[PDB]
Subunit: 185 residues, 6 copies
């Protein structure tokens, strides 16, 4: 269960604003079906497809059998089930959760992350960084990964929050995985 | 018959309410049917519950090929009454496990709680109406999410007195308390 | 009389006499339902089918029928909207009849919601349903046991002419409605 | 003549002459229905197809046809909306013709709703339907048996020119409409 | 010559309705390795989509006579596309053009230069009359189309079309798909050729 | 196994400069397309894919590649509504790149509608597109040949800064945009 379920703390848009989200993924023996649930809007659904494609494209580099998708079913779920969520900001979290699940490489505690993923692996800036970082801070998150191009937004963040968080701006998904996973992918 | 049948407490168009959840599992090719005027959030809770079972199949004594060899139908009468929300999550999981294992559900048990893929039980809303419905249904044991403990403090001690309430944190606790074997 | 059951269920005109048809031809397990059916009525067809699949062997049906038969449930008149769960037991009865070749009694009408456990749950609009049966010249009507008290709000002259069998379970329905002992 | 049947059913302008086409090429069981058909008309095609499957053997049709053939039902003119169940017996006839290579008689028109049991049910707008048939130079029209009474609301001069066959069931239809005996 | 010709395979000028009026349609088809899939694109309305379905069925029913093997056919995916991609197009009037394009694509038989066509297709291969003939023929004339195939039942509608447009266009009224294919394709599509002498 | 090409195409918000991404991963012939795409743009992806499929052999691609690959076309930014046919040639280029492993020049952007016959059709809003290319720091821009007329109304500073190549056909696009 835990073994077959990747778990990542993302920061992304919910109906009442940017918030901490626990992104869960299961990767059970199957035949290649992708399921995704959690009152997800279409942009967020599309971010999951992109995140899965990034992993399929890089399977060999990640030490994953390149034909895993014919022998796995994947379910991405984002509780709370009734709360509407949307937008692309959970993309790097989805990718991280999937890699974790497919490799058995656990996700670090005390880490949250926000950022739009692309098929090429680049991490794109997101909006509402202040709201997101405050949520991480309130939630007792120690380390936050943000898109490199959101560095400019750190200025508007209250000083005390900046001091409490360990903030890593990342350009690419390789950096995200190195920082977020317990072992070296 | 108590196999595959679980009393859930979850939201209905006629108030936060009691749900008689039915499941059937027959030899098939792996098709999943869910019926009973279920809203999208409730349908998703079924998918989540089923994934929990798949992830834990061997530990649960279920053949991990059931997804390929069994057709599963989840149905929630009354057929015309709209039902929705995530609160039947742990009941869906319990019903599925029971159906797949032939392990009957205990009489006079109901449960309410949102399920996650990791198996943690999350708090729900409208606890008072759910327990009221439980009380009128002659339920004796009710499983609720651990975080709904505080909400008990707004509930008539009449109802509290006649119910054996178990706040649960995880799905394993649920299966242990709900199943006969 | 095989694969044909007289049900009483809601239509756009109101609760009415309807002939539920079922065909179970050679195929690979495909379900089709037609007849201007609302989603609640569609779901009742699925529940009815699951009841049969779950009890196939005790019903005298080859348990692996569902990968060697295609099934079409049709409810004329094709253009008249119909909905609700009240044809459930009729759907189940028609499926059993079609799959076993046991003809359905033409003197019998039935109404009732079915559950996967094979319980018969009470319905609404009993008065309008039983008036339709009477006007149709139906002698015997099966109703859900919990609808017995609703009989008191239907004219006694109509009820006096009807042989009413309140039922709790699908086995009672099949016993009363099928020409031959299942 | 093969796979083409003259029907009478509702279009946006009214009940009128429909030419119903079917093709049944080798394939793997794809069903396509075109010609701006409304949902009720689409369901009548499904009902008609099931009637044929249920009687395939008796009609000289191999049972495996739903597995071996792609079937396309098309009703020109393509842009004209059509709906209702009154083309049911024509759909059934067209399918039987196509699947057996038995030519349809071009002097016959037909209207009627079909059931899975192969009964022919009464339809609406019989006057508009027969006027169209008559304006169209049709000599023989098959109508549902229970529409006989509706003939008396239609000008006698129109009815006098028509050879009208009331039918109760599908095998009558096929015998009257197909060139060779089915 | 080789280049121009294969650039005419699966390419047909139809005359049918667009949001910029009854106009010229450049219909394209590609037949590539596949599994029997059909795709159709080009901001097509439902009625036009159905005419493509009917056109394909016509081709399928005549596969033997057209020398298209089922073996080959089920190993192919077909994509019908009608640029410009964003312009809405609808109606049944491109039916015979769709059929011509499909036959061409599947048999590698190049469409003749400077032909356009309009007509509703039926499963029996009949060409049914269309609306807006004038505007369609105006669009063909404006485009320097030399030869236009139209439905036989539309011949009566030619009286509203000016003398010069009738002068510049070689109009062939057609009753059946067989006539359309013979007139539109470079090689005779139906049946082997038998030469007789008196 | 991800191809990437800079396209100029219509968006509801922000600039018209986009990165068209295509992945071609082990699969069984499924097409996925994402990026808040309107229907016309979705269709342009299908057209681009078919162009490649029809020319596979000549492009150095196994003709039956689609049996064993899945293709995902994604157009960031993911939440930006975008539409129109103008990314067509970029989509074609990205697919060829992905399937051959030939990288795309990053200093090149392109705009144009693609047909199945491989012709490049003119597009609208050339001015907004070239401005986005200019602000984006793009050196070279491929535009449809029939759009040349439209260059007359572009700022001279933009004209002076950009290397504009009008193109008529997909083969011209490929030789200009692909590196090797």
């Amino acid at each position: 269960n835990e073994n077959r379920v990747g778990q990542v703390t993302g920061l992304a848009w919910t109906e009442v604003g940017g918030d901490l989200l626990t992104i869960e993924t299961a990767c059970v023996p199957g035949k290649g079906k992708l399921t995704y649930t959690g009152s997800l809007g279409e942009v967020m659904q599309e971010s999951i497809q992109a995140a899965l494609t990034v992993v399929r494209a890089r399977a060999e580099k990640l030490g994953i059998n390149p034909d895993f998708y014919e022998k796995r079913d994947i379910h991405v779920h984002v509780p709370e089930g009734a709360t509407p969520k949307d937008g692309p900001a959970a993309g790097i979290a989805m990718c991280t959760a999937l890699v974790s699940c497919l490799t058995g490489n656990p996700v670090r505690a005390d880490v949250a992350m926000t950022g739009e993923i692309t098929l090429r692996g680049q991490v794109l800036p997101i909006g509402g960084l202040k709201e997101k970082l405050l949520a991480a801070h309130r939630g007792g998150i120690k380390t936050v990964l943000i898109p490199f191009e959101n560095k400019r937004d750190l200025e508007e963040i209250p000083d005390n929050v900046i001091a409490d968080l360990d903030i890593h701006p990342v350009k690419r998904i390789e950096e995200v995985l190195t920082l977020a996973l317990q072992n070296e992918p």
